[PDB]
Each structure stands twice: as C-alpha cells, then as structure tokens.
Ligand binder design. Structure first.
Ligand SMILES: CCOc1ccc(-c2nc3ccc(-c4nc5ccc(N6CCN(C)CC6)cc5[nH]4)cc3[nH]2)cc1
Ligand SMILES: CCOc1ccc(-c2nc3ccc(-c4nc5ccc(N6CCN(C)CC6)cc5[nH]4)cc3[nH]2)cc1
Ligand SMILES: Nc1ncnc2c1ncn2[C@@H]1O[C@H](COP(=O)(O)OP(=O)(O)OP(=O)(O)O)[C@@H](O)[C@H]1O
Ligand SMILES: Nc1ncnc2c1ncn2[C@@H]1O[C@H](COP(=O)(O)OP(=O)(O)OP(=O)(O)O)[C@@H](O)[C@H]1O
Lengths: 664, 573
C-alpha cells in the first residue's frame, strides 16, 4: 500500500529519524519545564507568605525581622521550636494582615475595626491583626529572592538548550525527508530507464515527469507534514499532558477532553473540506482551460461573435467557484480559529470554576501556580491544532500523488540487463516470418521477411508515404519476441541483450531532440570515454560539415532551446554527426518529410553521401533524391512486401514513383 | 499600503461590507482583552477573602457571553472580509476576461498566452489576498498590537510592559530577515528543481535516443543523480527555516521569563498582584501573531502592488483600435472596393509592405493563389479588420470599412482560418458556434453540404461526440470540413476559406466547392488554396508573390501568360 512503501523508504535513514525524535523529545522536555518552574516560583516563593510561620530566636539567617521580632517560615524551618508562636499572614483584599496568634482555621477573611474576622460557613472567629507597610512585606518576601535566581536561571538554562535541540530536530527531519526523496527520485528514474517504450507511448511526457518530479515534491511535503506537524505536535502534546497530570490529575482529565474534540473537528473538516477543495481545484482548472481555449481561439470567437456566450460560461464557472469558496470560508470561520478561541476561553472557564471551588473550603491556597502553568501550557497545546487539522485535510492529495508514484515503482516487465560491447557487428540483417501486433487486435506487420546484405542495405520506403513505416524502427529493439524472428550476422536479435543490439545501432529521428548543454555535450552526451575523442570527431565534423555559424569558435556553444535554435538543417547535421561518432555499423536515418527542401537540405544530402558510406544505412526513402540514389528499394504493402528493386519498382509500378515525384 | 489607494473603486463600491467588518474586528479586538483581565481579577478575588460563589457564577457567565460574542463576531468579520477577497477575485477574473474578449490579435502577439494566464492565476490571488488577509494584518499589526500594549500598560503595568516587549520587535525584524533569506534560497532551489524537471523531460522525450546510443544506465542516471544532489541543496533553505521556530521560542520564552521575574519582583514590592501577572502572560501569548503579521503584511502588500500593476498594464494600459463611432450603414450588395490598400504588421518598419489594388462585386468568386508567406492570408486579415486599418481604403459599396458597425461587419464574414481550431466541445456545438440560436433542421442540411456528414453519422460516434482537447477520432480534413460547416451554418453574406480544402485531395474538394457555389447562389466567396483546382472555377482569379499582385484575371489568361499557374497546375497532377 501507500503507507507501507512510505514506511519502507523511511526505515532507510532510520538513524537520522531516531536522532531527530530524540533531540525533539529533549527539546520538548526542556521547553515544557519552564511553566513548571513558574509553578514552583508562584507556589513556593510568591505565595510562601501564605504558608504558616513560626517564631524562633534570631540565630539562623532565614529568619526575618518584623518590628524587632524574628519569624522563620515552616518550609524553611530546621525544627528548633514547634508550636512556638505560630503565626499566619492572611490576605484581606489588597492588604496582607499579620496574625501573630495561631490561626485556628481559614475562611473568608474580613477586616473591621482593626480586627480580622474569618468566617467559614456558619462559624466565625475573630483575631487581632495589624496592616503591614510596603517595606515590611518586602522584607518578608526577601527570604525567597535568593532562591528565585535559581528557578529563573533554570528557566533561562532549559530554554537555551531546547532552542538548539529544536533547531537540530527540525534540520534532521528536513534532511531525512530530502534524503528519502533523493533516494525515491533516483529509484524512480532508474525504474524509468528499465521500463519499456510502451509506457511512454501510452501517456505523454508530462505525466511521466509529474511522477518523477512533482509527485515526489508532494511526497516531500507529506513527509515534512507527518514529521513536523503530526509527530512533533504529538510528542509535544504528550509531554504537555504528562506535565498537566503531574500538576493536577483531576483537571488534566478535563484537559484530555480536547483530544476527542480534535478527533471530531479534524474528521468533520476532512469530510467537508475534501469536497469543497476538490471542487475549487477542479473549477479553477476548468477556468484556466476556458481562458486558454479562448486566447488560443479568440479570433474564431470574434469571427462568429461567441464572446457573450463564452463570457456566460466563464461566469458560470467563476460563480460556482465563488459559491464553493464562500462555503469553505463559512466552514473555516466556524471551525478553524474561532473554535480555538472558544476552546481557550472555555478552558479559562474550567480553570476559574475548579480553582474557585478550591478557594471554597481549604484547597485553594497553593494552587494558583498550577493555574499559571495550565494557562501557559494550554496556549502551547491549542496553537498547533489548526495546523494538524488542515494538514490532515490535505494529506489525501499527497496520498494520491504517492500512489501514482508507487504505481510506477511497482510495475513489472522491466527490461533490466547488461550492456556487452565486446565486438562490432557486420550488419547482415535478415527477417523471417516477422509479425508484430502492437495493438493486440490489429496486425500491423503481416509476415514481413527480407534479407539485408552485408552493407549497402538502403531498402526502405513507406506505403506511399505515412503508412506503416516508422514502426520498423521500433521493430528491432523496442518491441521484440512477438512472432517470427530477426537475425543479425546469423544470430538472433531476441536472444541477445537489448543493449547489445543498441550498442552499434544509430538512429536519427524525424524530430531530433537537441539536448541541453554544449553542442559537444549535445553530440557526445557527456560520454566519459569519449572526451578527447569528441574533439577528434569534432575535427571530422568541421571538415565534413563546417560550422557556418561559429559563434564561440569551438564546441562551447550552449544549446538554448529544445530544437532548431539556429536552423532546422543544423539539427540534422548534429544528428548525423552523433551517428557517425558512435558507430557506422548499423543505422536508420529519418524520413525527412517535415523538412521544406531548401538549399540547406543539399548540405544534408552531402551528409547523406557521407553517412551512406557506413555499413547498412536504412533510409525511409520519402524524398525523390533518396529514392533515386538508393542502392536497393523495398516498398511495403501494409507490412507485406510489394517487391524489391530500385528499377524493378520503377518498371512495374510507375505510379508509385510518379506519385512520389508529384508529392516531392 | 500603496495598493489600497489603487483599489479605491473596490472599497468605494463595497464600503458597507468592509466598514462592518472593520467595526466588528475592532470590537472583538477590544473584547479579547477582557477574558484575561477577568481571569486575573478572579485570581485576585480568590486570594482575597471576599470570594463567593456569586463571583464564580458572574465570571463564568461573563466568559460564556464574551466567548459567544467573539465567536459570532469572528464568523461575521471573517465572512465579510474574506468574502470580499473572493469577490474581488471574481471581479478581476470577470474584468480580465471581458478585456481579453474585446482585444484583437496584436495584444496576443505582444503578450504571450502564458503571461496572461499567469495574470489570471497568481496576480488575482495576490490582489484578493491584499483585500482580505492584508487588511486583517494591517488591523492586527496596528490596532490589536497597540490595544494589547495599552492594556498591558494601563490595566497591568508600564514597567513590566516595556520590559517584556523589548524582545518582540527583535522577533519582528528577525522574522523579516529570515523571511527574506528564505525567499532567496527557496527561489534558488526552485530554479534547481526546474532544471531537474527540464532535464527529466529532455530524457523522457529523447528516450529513444538515450536507448539507441547506449546511455541508459550510464549518463542520464548520472545526470539525474547529480541534479538530485543539487535539489538536495534545499538544506540551505532548511538551515534558515530551522531558525524560524527556535528564534521565536527563544525570544518569546525570554519575554515570558521577563514577565514572570519582574512580576515576581513587583509583587514583592506590592506593585502587582498574581492575577495581573497571569494576565500579562496571556496577553504576551496574544501579542505573538502581530509580530509575524507585520512581515507578512509587508510581503503581501508588496506582492499585491506588483500584481495589480501587472494586471493594470494589460487591463488599463491597453485599448483596441476599433471604434464604430457613428454607424449609419446597412447590409451592402457585395460591391467591395480595395482600389488601393497597403499595410504591414509590426514585424517590419514599413519595409515588407503589402500593397494591393483590387475590387469585387456580389457573386464574384475571387480565387487567390501564390507561394507560402506571400500575402494571401494578409489581405483577408485586413478585410476582417482585426488589425488597425491600413493606408489606402477598403470600401463597402461606398462607405469606408472603418465606419461600418463592427458587430454587423464581423457577422457578415464567415471565415475559415488555416488553423482549424476547435473549442473542446461536441461537433454539434462546434457547428452551432456559428449560429448560436436554437437547433433546427438547418444544421443537418449545413453539415450535409460540407460532405463530411456521410462519415459523421458513422465514424466519429455520430454528432454528439467530444472533439478537441485531443478529442476522439481526429483528422485534419475532418476538422476542416467541420470548420466549413460552421461557416455555412453562420450563413454569411461573405464566405472566406483560407486553405481548408488542402487537407483532402482535390477530387472531393472540387465537388464540394461546386456544391457550395451552387448553394450560395451569388453570395460573395473568397477562396485561398495553394492548389488551383478549386480556383479554376472562380470567375475572378489573382496570383500574388511577395505581397504583390503578379497577375490578375481569368484562368485562361493565367494559363496563357502566367507560367506559374500552368506549371503548378501540372505539378500537382
Ligand atoms: C482569498 C483569501 O484566501 C485566504 C488566504 C489566507 C487566509 C488565511 N491564512 C491564515 C493564517 C493564519 C490566520 C490567523 N492566525 C491567527 C492566530 C491568532 C489570531 N487571533 C485571534 C482572533 N483575533 C481577531 C486576532 C488574533 C488570529 C489569527 N488569524 C489567518 C489566516 N487567514 C485565509 C484566506
Ligand atoms: C513558546 C511560545 O509558544 C509559541 C507560540 C507560537 C509559536 C509560533 N511559531 C510560529 C511559527 C510560524 C507561524 C506562522 N507561520 C506562517 C506561515 C504562513 C503564514 N501566512 C498565512 C497565509 N498567508 C497567505 C501567508 C502568510 C503565517 C504563518 N504564521 C506561527 C507561529 N507561532 C511558537 C511558540
Ligand atoms: N503507441 C502505439 N501503439 C500501437 N501502434 C502504434 C503506436 N504508435 C504507432 N503505432 C502504429 O503506427 C502505424 C503507422 O503509423 P506510424 O506511426 O508508423 O507513422 P507513419 O504514418 O508510417 O508515418 P512515417 O511516414 O513517419 O513512418 C499504425 O498502424 C499504428 O498502429
Ligand atoms: N499575426 C501576425 N503577426 C505578425 N506577423 C504576421 C502575422 N501574420 C502574418 N505575419 C507575417 O506574414 C508572414 C505570413 O504572411 P501570410 O500569412 O500572408 O502568407 P501566406 O502565404 O498567405 O500564408 P498562407 O497562405 O499559408 O496562409 C509571416 O511569416 C509574418 O512575417
């Protein structure tokens, strides 16, 4: 399946992924420690005054002076005196009131007539208290300052370690993704090179290139999604809930309600947004298609005045686009960020309710630090929810692209083999009962059989032009082992390796594709062995076909366009040059139908007079000069054989030569 | 900010939507300041002894009310703004298409199809992004940021506020810097990926050559491996992308830590409470998004200004030279005078001048012969009034060509171009393209006159069969016949055929020409074929060479004097 193969490629480079996850985990732990440090700083130091105090002799440094009386805190005690003037510093509104006497029990504190009255339910009890001045409160807050430049230092110290590891994990997840995609692109291209011509002849080049390049970018986005959005946030959320359960289990089990919420919202968003975004993408493609059809066919519209109806169709598509886009806007409004803000405010509600209930009875004294920690953690929790949800909605297109690639990778009937080039063939080609049905139903070749001689085999002609011709170029090597047999020098074509067949053949297409790079690179194709020999053959090329342009005075001219950058004739010159460079042992030239028959073709004719010096130069003799200058001629009757003879065809069937003279 | 001055027509037309949206947006940006301060007040009340369940119910109810208000108002401003954005995209698609429809070949000769189709996709999306998300980031960067700042200052503390906010502008400028560098390196890697795509397309298209000369597992594998190692230099992008999150985390964590520490020092000095400190950490979480939004607004408005300039360069900076300002004419009896007319396209500075002197009358079939590239199509292109008018004059039965109503004029001409282009529709709809009224029996007679109907009922799955966009059962002659049938279904006063007959041999096409000339019954017809068979039946024939009339007259005078006519008549057969 799709996910199985993605896991297969990801288990490769497992060291980088495991390193990334570990660095991530450390960074997450470090980053999430900070709010727990804030909890410590709140509940211990800033709320330590709320904790009980004792009176002891001023021997320890922890003890703090209060109007000449030294009071030491319970948590900070060394057990010198128990129940020795127990004291409470309760808070009445914005005024911390000192209660020297041992407070019996907490409650709703109120200050009346310079006396503190504490009420708990029905019962109430009063004590004497004195309002503290700013200085006194600060002095009592002094036995914490010393311990607050460790908590702060820890927060600072665990925030500059997390940062480096966070950089590390993001880089490693990236590196792992791009390396996996590198391996995937290399594997796909190697499998392309093994695959047959039939796959290319079915669909255009665009689908192939999309599978190699564009779909692999989609898979890169998938891997970065899964790793940086799902896995990262998953580990983050796990650590967050770990901390929340270490803080308050009862409230954390409320906070876990967000996970079913995310499940529900991401499921609904998928279910609807897949439909809406599919329709938007389809309609946008339809709109761009309408614009391209219009611009290409504007003159025809103007001629017949179809512009009003065309604009009506365009506005129909555009208004449907606007409808679906507005519906998706409604969904995203109700269910992307506004919902996050809702969840955030409701979380604050749950906090206020729970901690208010704590502020009732006597469980709300040390808990406000937990409130701060929850408030800090939940913002970290609700941030990536939108990213998770949107990427979950977007995963389906990436799974589609990945499946389209793994269809290509999992294809069978590959042409894998070696390339023996041990000896040069003589070129005694022959055929016996050769019948090849490319369309399985339709027979394209009907028992063709002819014996080419040892060189000077120039016998090829289409069925009066544009009939059953070019497929014979495909007959030898691209399609094989259907029926009949074909031999070269007394040995079978099918038994030999296909690269061994191609090791000595050389073909000029009807549309020679000029490769990128230099003209020397376009000819030699950057062959490693043929570096200096490319220049040695370039001497022969300039001697035979001189550089009339000669823009850089060498072979450094970069090829700019795919074909006919300089002239249509130069394309053929480069093609014949590439043919003569590799091997003149066997070669099949183009049909030259597309060419205009300018004077430059005469130079190509001279190149033919060079190129026919080689061994067994097949030529689809469409041109009159190619017909007359042929050593032998073989016109085919729809894959069958009319006859053989340069003059015998002229004698018997005068209409063929006359028709080719009329056409050419 | 400049682009918002340019789109004043859009905001003036839709002032109500944007006014309502900005009102709700400022209202909810004010209302978001209340939940954290209420939480802080609740903490301070809990710490205080006066806490009661009535306070709990009050804070809970107020939170629910503010929550629902923020959700509802959020939905409505999102709907209004982003509906305005999608609506601007609709309007600009409509404007661009209405411009392209009312624009002649010259504009396409200058501006390639790729650029115009790019304007319809990227530039409109950028402009719509500015009217939507751009306005939003302008609001959230200025008003939300300053509201957060002023609330943190007044309602909590000014010392804390100015201490804690010091790293956030550093975050803002760092985000702008990293965003710029990511854009540069992503452009570089995208260029590398484009190179990879070009090389793979070259290998795929030239796969026969890569197989023929044995470079299957030798050279193209090395090229794809090396270029994939170059596309692996998106690690240079990752080095900058991976500083985006940790820089933010570092600065924000420092801001939280400043807030915590200084708040814990101010609570010691009795300048703050715990709840105000907690509310500060909440507002610090609110404040992060604006500091991103500043950089995103800069990028968005710059890209939108560029896109709007690019759109208006076509829309506002182009106008067709075609203005029937005062039509006072009626359907003319084919006495069309070209006594002198001369012009060029912009492809030369009046050097390769086409320079013609001719006249025709109703029923005068005007065959036009010549070699390739020799002006034959150019004269009818001038008759079609696609380009601005040449020197001299073309006159229709007394009135010049320029004064004729353009719609009526272009409706007189039933024109079959050399490129039989189909619209990727059904054959019936392609034929009714000419006569866009409701279908009747005339379409069957019209396609029967084309002579392709005998093949159309059987071979291409009947009439209702998709053709175009690679269609089904394609053929150039069949497309030519469908084009001729389209022209016939238009029922033109003036028929023009440019090389449509050349696809099929002269044996059927000559009979088709004869049947057309029989059916028209004296309507004007122009024939432009490289062959001379159809031309032979023309009552008037002319031969052009180099954009100049070599000879003109009947077929007999050409066969006597013009050697090119007899020689080409003999060469084809
Ligand atoms: C053709 C159009 O196409 C669109 C293009 C972009 C977006 C779009 N992409 C976005 C990414 C993030 C945000 C966004 N992220 C936010 C984080 C916090 C906040 N708050 C909450 C609420 N208040 C009001 C402001 C601060 C708002 C936020 N808004 C909005 C976005 N809007 C929508 C439509
Ligand atoms: C520890 C403290 O807690 C944290 C709080 C917030 C973040 C945080 N880190 C972020 C990194 C990036 C973004 C963010 N990335 C964006 C990418 C694109 C865009 N827009 C949306 C769409 N439009 C069209 C283009 C620009 C906004 C974006 N906003 C938000 C971020 N929020 C990190 C820690
Ligand atoms: N992808 C394909 N699958 C099956 N058959 C194909 C395919 N491509 C071409 N052919 C065969 O090609 C035959 C004839 O046309 P071909 O493509 O050989 O060019 P042609 O018309 O002979 O022109 P040329 O003069 O250039 O050779 C058809 O019978 C057709 O079946
Ligand atoms: N739309 C155009 N824009 C620019 N130049 C043009 C345009 N149409 C024609 N030309 C110029 O005129 C040449 C072709 O002229 P024209 O089409 O009159 O020749 P033709 O022999 O009538 O062609 P055909 O008879 O095959 O249609 C072009 O190669 C070019 O130089």
């Amino acid at each position: 399946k799709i996910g199985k193969t993605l896991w297969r490629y990801a288990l490769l480079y497992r060291k980088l992924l495991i390193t990334a996850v570990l660095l991530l985990t450390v960074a997450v732990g470090a980053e999430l420690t900070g709010p727990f440090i804030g909890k410590k700083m709140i509940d211990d130091h800033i709320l330590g005054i709320e904790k009980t105090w004792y009176e002891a002799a001023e021997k320890d440094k922890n003890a703090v002076q209060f109007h000449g009386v030294s009071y030491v805190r319970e948590d900070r005690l060394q057990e010198p005196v128990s129940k020795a003037k127990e004291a409470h510093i309760y808070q009445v509104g914005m005024a911390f009131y000192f209660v020297d006497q041992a407070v019996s029990f907490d409650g709703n504190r109120t200050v009346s007539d310079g006396k503190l009255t504490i009420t708990n339910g029905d019962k109430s009890r009063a004590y004497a208290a004195e309002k503290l001045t700013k200085q006194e409160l600060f002095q009592f807050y002094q036995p914490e300052i010393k311990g607050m430049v460790l908590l702060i230092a820890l927060y600072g110290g665990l925030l500059v370690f997390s940062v480096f590891f966070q950089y590390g994990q993001h880089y490693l997840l990236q590196m792992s993704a791009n390396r996996i995609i590198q391996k995937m692109r290399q594997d796909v291209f190697s499998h392309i090179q093994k695959m047959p011509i039939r796959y290319f002849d079915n669909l255009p080049a665009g689908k192939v290139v999309a599978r190699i390049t564009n779909d692999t970018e989609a898979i890169r986005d998938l891997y970065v999604t899964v790793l940086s959005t799902f896995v990262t946030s998953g580990i983050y959320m796990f650590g967050i809930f770990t901390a929340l359960f270490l803080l308050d289990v009862k409230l954390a089990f409320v906070a876990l309600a967000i996970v079913p919420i995310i499940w529900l919202w991401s499921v609904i968003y998928r279910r609807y947004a897949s439909y809406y975004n599919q329709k938007i993408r389809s309609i946008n493609s339809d709109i761009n298609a309408k614009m391209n059809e219009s611009i290409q066919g504007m003159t025809i519209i103007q001629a017949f005045r179809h512009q009003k109806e065309t604009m009506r169709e365009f506005e129909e598509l555009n208004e449907s686009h606007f409808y679906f886009q507005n519906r998706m806007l409604n969904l995203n409004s109700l269910m992307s960020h506004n919902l996050v803000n809702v969840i955030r405010n409701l979380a604050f509600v749950a906090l206020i309710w729970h901690f208010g209930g704590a502020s009732l009875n006597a469980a709300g004294i040390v808990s406000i630090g937990v409130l701060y920690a929850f408030v800090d953690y939940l913002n970290r929790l609700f941030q990536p929810i939108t990213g998770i949800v949107n990427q979950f909605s977007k995963l389906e297109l990436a799974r589609v692209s990945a499946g389209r690639v793994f269809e290509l990778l999992e294809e069978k009937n590959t042409e894998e083999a070696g390339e023996p080039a041990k000896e040069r063939a003589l070129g005694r080609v022959e055929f016996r009962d050769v019948s090849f049905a490319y369309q399985e139903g339709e027979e394209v070749l009907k028992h063709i059989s002819f014996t080419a001689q040892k060189g000077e085999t120039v016998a090829l002609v289409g069925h009066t032009g544009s009939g059953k011709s070019s497929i014979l170029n495909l007959l030898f090597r691209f399609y094989d082992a259907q029926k009949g047999d074909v031999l070269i020098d007394g040995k079978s074509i099918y038994n030999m390796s296909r690269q061994e067949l191609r090791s000595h053949m050389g073909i000029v297409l009807q549309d020679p594709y000029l490769f990128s790079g230099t003209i020397g690179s376009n000819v030699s194709l950057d062959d490693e062995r043929m570096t200096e020999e490319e220049i040695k053959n370039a001497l022969r090329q300039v001697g035979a076909e001189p550089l009339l342009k000669k823009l850089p005075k060498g072979i450094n001219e970069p090829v700019i366009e795919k074909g006919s950058t300089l002239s249509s004739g130069e394309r053929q010159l480069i093609s014949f040059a590439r043919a003569l460079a590799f091997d003149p042992a066997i070669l099949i030239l183009d049909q030259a139908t597309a060419h205009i028959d300018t004077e430059t073709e005469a130079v190509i004719q001279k190149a033919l007079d060079v190129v026919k010096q080689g061994r067994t130069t097949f030529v689809i003799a469409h041109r009159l000069s190619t017909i007359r200058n042929a050593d032998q001629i073989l016109v085919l009757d729809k894959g069958e054989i009319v006859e053989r003879g340069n003059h015998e065809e002229l004698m018997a069937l005068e209409g063929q030569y006359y028709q080719m003279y009329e056409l050419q | 900010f400049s682009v918002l001055k340019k789109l004043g027509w859009f905001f003036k037309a839709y002032w109500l939507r944007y006014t309502i949206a900005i009102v709700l947006l400022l209202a909810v940006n004010v209302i978001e300041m209340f939940p954290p301060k209420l939480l802080g007040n609740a903490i301070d009340d809990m710490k205080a002894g006066a806490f009661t369940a009535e306070g709990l119910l009050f804070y809970i109810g107020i939170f629910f009310v503010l929550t629902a208000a923020v959700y509802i108002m959020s939905y409505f401003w999102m709907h209004q703004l982003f509906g305005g954005a999608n609506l601007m995209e609709k309007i600009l698609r409509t404007k661009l298409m209405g411009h392209l429809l009312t624009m002649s070949p010259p504009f396409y000769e200058k501006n390639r199809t790729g650029d115009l189709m790019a304007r319809g996709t990227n530039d409109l999306q950028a402009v719509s992004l500015t009217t939507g998300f751009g306005i939003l980031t302008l609001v959230d960067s200025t008003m939300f940021m300053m509201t957060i700042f002023l609330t943190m200052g007044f309602l909590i503390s000014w010392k804390l506020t100015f201490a804690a906010i010091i790293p956030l502008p550093v975050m803002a400028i760092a985000i702008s810097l990293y965003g710029s560098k990511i854009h540069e390196r992503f452009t570089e890697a995208q260029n590398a990926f484009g190179a990879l795509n070009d090389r793979v397309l070259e290998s795929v298209s030239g796969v026969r050559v890569i197989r023929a000369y044995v470079q299957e597992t030798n050279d193209v594998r090395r090229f794809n491996e090396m270029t994939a190692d170059v596309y692996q230099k998106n690690m240079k992008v990752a080095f900058i992308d991976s500083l985006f999150e940790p820089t933010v985390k570092l600065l924000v964590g420092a801001s939280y830590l400043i807030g915590l520490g200084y708040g814990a020092f101010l609570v010691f000095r009795n300048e703050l409470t715990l709840g105000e400190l907690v509310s500060f950490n909440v507002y610090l979480g609110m404040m992060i998004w604006p500091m991103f939004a500043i950089g995103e607004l800069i990028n968005v408005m710059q890209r939108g200004n560029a896109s709007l300039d690019r759109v208006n360069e076509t829309l506002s900076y182009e106008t067709d030279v075609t203005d029937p300002k005062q039509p006072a004419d009626l359907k003319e009896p084919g006495d069309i005078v070209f006594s002198h007319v001369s012009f060029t396209y912009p492809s030369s500075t009046s050097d390769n001048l086409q320079d013609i002197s001719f006249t025709v009358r109703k029923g005068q079939t005007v065959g036009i012969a010549g070699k390739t590239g020799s002006g034959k199509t150019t004269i009818i292109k001038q008759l079609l009034r696609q380009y601005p008018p040449g020197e001299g004059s073309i006159t229709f039965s007394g009135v010049p060509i320029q004064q004729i109503p353009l719609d009526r004029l272009r409706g007189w001409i039933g024109y079959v171009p050399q490129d039989h282009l189909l619209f990727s529709r059904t054959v019936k709809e392609n034929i009714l393209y000419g006569k866009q009224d409701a279908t009747d029996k005339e379409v069957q007679q019209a396609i029967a006159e084309a002579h392709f109907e005998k093949d159309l009922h059987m071979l291409p799955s009947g009439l209702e069969t998709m053709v175009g966009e690679k269609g089904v059962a394609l053929s150039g002659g069949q497309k030519q016949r469908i084009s001729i049938a389209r022209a016939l279904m238009a029922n033109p006063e003036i028929l023009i055929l440019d090389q449509s007959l050349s696809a099929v041999d002269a044996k059927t096409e000559a009979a088709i020409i004869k049947n057309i000339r029989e059916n028209r019954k004296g309507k004007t017809t122009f024939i432009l074929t490289h062959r001379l068979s159809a031309v032979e039946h023309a009552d008037l024939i002319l031969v052009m060479d180099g954009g100049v009339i070599a000879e003109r007259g009947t077929h007999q005078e050409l066969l006597a004097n013009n050697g090119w006519y007899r020689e080409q008549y003999e060469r084809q057969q």
